[PDB]
Amino acid sequence: SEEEKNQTKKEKHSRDIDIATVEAMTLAHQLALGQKNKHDLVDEGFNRYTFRDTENLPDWFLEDEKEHSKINKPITKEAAMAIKEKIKAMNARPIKKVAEAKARKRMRAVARLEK
Amino acid sequence: TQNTIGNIPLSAYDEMPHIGYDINGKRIMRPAKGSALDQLLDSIELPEGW
Amino acid sequence: EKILQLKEDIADLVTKVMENTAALGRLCKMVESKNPNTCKFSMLALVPVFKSIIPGYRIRPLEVSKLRNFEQALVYNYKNYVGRLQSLSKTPSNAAPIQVSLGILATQAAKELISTASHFNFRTDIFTLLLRRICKPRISTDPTSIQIIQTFETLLNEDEEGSISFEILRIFNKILKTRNFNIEESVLNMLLSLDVLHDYDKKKDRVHLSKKQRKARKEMQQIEEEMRNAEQAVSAEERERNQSEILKIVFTIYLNILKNNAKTLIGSVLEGLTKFGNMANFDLLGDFLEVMKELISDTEFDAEVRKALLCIVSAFSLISNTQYMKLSKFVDGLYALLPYICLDADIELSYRSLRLADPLNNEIIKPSVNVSTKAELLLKALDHVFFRSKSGTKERATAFTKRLYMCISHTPEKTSIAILKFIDKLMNRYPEIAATLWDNALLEKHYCPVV
Predict the structure, then answer these.
(1) What's the CA gap between C182 and C441, in Å, rounded?
(2) How far is B40 from chain C, CA to nearest CA, in Å?
């Protein structure tokens, strides 16, 4: 029962690890295809916003910093593709909603013969 | 690099048993023939660094 | 007879709390260690106390009526209550019979709680305490197991919005990832019970109120109108989120069993993949079928006969379940298998090996992939060819008949009756085509006066 509590330390880790944004996705591409290596990103990591304590500070201050501490790095369409392919869940497009989509478009094709 | 095919689309080699050629010309074979179960698993619970 | 005095002391404490905050804390002080009779007679007596006294609104999120000391009383004492239950049911098979009986009665207490509790935020502890009891390689000495499976089944049949089911299957996934899928098939039947996933659809007598009271009533009605519409929108989004993540959990559970290849579990795996299929991403339908083709091709390198029959029946049931919207290797799967089916002696076997309970409404619920032995698998594969999922094929009608007649020579009696009953239905469809030689006199009086 130790692994029942030790594997969860990796399961919760890989939630703070997984990519959510387009801005993180581009940099993951820039690693994957050989454009930027580890050494290049460690240079880029030193921002306008580095060397900041975060654990001692009250939440009403950090919730105003974190909103406004986002450096607008350039994106790609190549990254936006994959991040839309990452978020799309299972029940996003079932048989039901496909049949319903055609049921919508048939009604539209009828409404343009009503005139 | 060890794969030696540039900014070309990987649309090519989708019908080949190899991904390109390398320096001193030999066939870089596609490494594994995975199961249909594992491929469906990786489209529900996607891999760690996907 | 000290037991009788203790019974009456606890009885007095029950009549105190049911009809007060120090008494419940005293009842938790009763069950600590070393005294088994106080550890069992009160623990099962606190169950109707908690059944009557638990407020279902998610208690503990931190005037005259305090309702804060009472709720710190209920919650803090409930921590050590369930924590005591944790220490009770963790005892392995190599223990004292008193301690083991304490474990059986503890899980009995827990499964009684779950039907009324699991509302407030001390549920995950009880869910671990029952799923860790179910997920064991050996069940032949626990009478509770069948009943706990039943309670989880009911839990997944009232759960409309999907919050309960997701909180169960996260813990359940943890257990199935630590232990390399050593499950008892009844647990995949409780996986089938999930109703989250599928859809299948006066003027005279008035108490007089003040003007300020009536205006308060109008405002309260308007607040409740907002609560109706907002909770409808929230739960409609919650159902979508829970479907999206439960289907991720359910399928990865299934396909990892399809890695390990346990001989008994595949039937229940394909129970799930056909029921909870057609609610996936609709790009996965081609992927599911290509998996079924793969699991056919694995058997083509040589128990496995069961697996290939399952693949055929499952595929046709999948496409016949596509109710809302608008197959070569599977018909050819049968056309190749029919020698191997009849060449085996294991055609008739009741199949009650490791499964304990027949899950829910087995009279109404038709287990459309693993109905009986294998005789009804041949029947339902052929029914799912020539009566469901078109594939008309008069050529294949003549071919399947000519292979069945080279299978009558290798059949038990009941199976040959059923096969000839299907050939009667093929004479209904395609007009071309104790004893031992029964009723073949009938069908061979449908060759000679017809052809």
Answers:
(1) 51
(2) 7
